[PDB]
Amino acid sequence: ELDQLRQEAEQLKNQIRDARKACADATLSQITNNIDPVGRIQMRTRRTLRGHLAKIYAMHWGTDSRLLVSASQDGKLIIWDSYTTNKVHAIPLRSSWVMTCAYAPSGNYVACGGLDNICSIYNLKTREGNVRVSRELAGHTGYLSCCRFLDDNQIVTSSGDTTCALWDIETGQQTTTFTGHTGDVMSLSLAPDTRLFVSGACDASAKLWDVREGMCRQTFTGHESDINAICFFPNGNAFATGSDDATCRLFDLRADQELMTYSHDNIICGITSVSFSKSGRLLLAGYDDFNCNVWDALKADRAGVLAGHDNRVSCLGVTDDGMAVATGSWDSFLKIWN
Amino acid sequence: TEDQRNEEKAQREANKKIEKQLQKDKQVYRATHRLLLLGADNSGKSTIVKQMRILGIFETKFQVDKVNFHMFDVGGQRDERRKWIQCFNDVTAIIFVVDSSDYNRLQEALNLFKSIWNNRWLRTISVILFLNKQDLLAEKVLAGKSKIEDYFPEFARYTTPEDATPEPGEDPRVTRAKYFIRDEFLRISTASGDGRHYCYPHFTCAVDTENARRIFNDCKDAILQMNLREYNLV
């Protein structure tokens, strides 16, 4: 029976491959060769945010695009004011190891995680004026990698136990568990319609889940190594993933197919974080080789390098209004690029 | 414009207070020395940690010679470690507790050590090698049932090193076996690494009163070498 199961699984896999081939027609690069090239983009550093003691893994820009949060292995959840370079808050974490940071759209809640398997949620607007743990979410098993806020009451969190769980801060329960991955899921991104999201695991797969029904609508594959960076396109029908094999892809949700590979021969270091701009021509991707790259999403051509960092760039975040981008590396420095 | 002025002054005062608190924490963060324990599944990590506590992550705090150390023992995680091992780059030393009596998992332990030594974020960290379960190794070698040569074919063409320092109550066969394991680890240690990180072999048992001093000497030598390379003294 197992042999028959494997045979029919292969049959369905090659049927899906045949469907993809039938929906190929032509490549995007061939039909988009008439676009005027953007050319060199010279982005300088505006303000350097230096108040951290250890490496930085996670940051998230605010909805107001004025203030941002940062992570550090010392145990700090500092909230910075990018315009003035003023630290408005400094949250001492119970567990020194944090890898995820989320800023609620309401502006009152800030999330954190780490190896403690706890998605602690901190509230800001309090009568006493001091930050505190709003809720201590527990139930995961693996290392906590990326958490994001659906709203003031629900968050989607990815852990190292190959599952993504949607929580309810008010009641502290796992409403739905998305159990479809083989390896460690690391990065997840939220669509602008806040009903679908894509998650990237260490099995070179990207899965588009349905928030309400709690099932995997479709899966995307085509990378060679583990993917740890993912981000929705602003329109909501595309998303880019950055693997460890020095390649950046762009899968479209509707067609279930790869569009381009953003890679070069001279690049041998893996991608860490990716973040689209507010238009689409700008696809920013972090890198291990002490710098950042700025790709063009419609021509797969390099345009501009955000060099000026030491160690590994471990995060990447573009403001909602697109005015600037922040790249934090392991040297405990956050740099604002205009 | 008064509202903007007082808001700016309040932000400046809050920033100053945050700077003061961060400096006070900075006086503490560098004082502690971070440590990490790695090894096989049945390696004596928690045993050593619990034994020297008297003197997910299972932390421990202890101070010797007026400086304190922090040891990290992750046990609430899975067995895939290629993603959460990057978090421990800024760690003073890595303690590699290894099984020495069960030779079946010795190959897995050597592969684990090879992955750590050649890792492209852990190539700076010095590794402390704890050959745990020495008493059980002595009991097993003296029994003779295990046939250590079966698991390692090239053990037969091996003799004790000239610089061996056996304890007075030991046996040539057991000291040969333990130094064989030590050299099997060191050949992987020596094969790569251009002086950036150093491996120190140490024969330790779980219930040992001098386990802290071994870590002290290892960390002192590692930091001394790092400082010498940092200075012009190389």
């Epitope: 083989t182 390896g183 583990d226 094999d245 020095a246 | 899975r78 067995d79 290629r82 050649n118």
Partner: nanobody, 126 residues
């Protein structure tokens, strides 16, 4: 997708020769370092042998030293383990595992949990 299919493997009495062929697709064969892993009945996973990108950095496990012969054909994207002088202890399942990160000499691919980058394995019985 990355697919690792193993070929060969039958019931052979002690002695004889078996040629296990690994079929690799969906990735660049040359860049990645590969290895073989066993799964004996009633026991856990173990590591057999590994070869680097070029193939001149071959290493073997303690259990077998001269009884196996691992080599790669980067042109045809194949990995082989020429085995001879078999023993009854080698009644395991052989998976053609691959280290995740390209252009590196470290990989953690002996995990008991379902490692992504390895095939179902072929049964060899002695």
């Amino acid at each position: 997708q990355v697919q690792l299919q193993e070929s060969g493997g039958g019931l052979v009495q002690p002695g004889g020769s078996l040629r296990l062929s690994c079929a690799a697709s969906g990735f660049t064969f040359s860049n990645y370092k590969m290895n073989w892993v066993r799964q004996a009945p009633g026991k856990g996973l173990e590591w057999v042998s590994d070869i680097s990108q070029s193939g001149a950095s071959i290493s073997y496990t303690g259990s077998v030293k001269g009884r196996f012969t691992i080599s790669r054909d980067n042109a045809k994207n194949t990995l082989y383990l020429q085995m001879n002088s078999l023993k009854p202890e080698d009644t395991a399942v052989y998976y053609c595992a691959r280290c995740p990160a390209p252009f590196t000499r470290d990989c953690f691919d002996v995990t008991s949990t379902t490692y992504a980058y390895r095939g179902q394995g072929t049964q060899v019985t002695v």
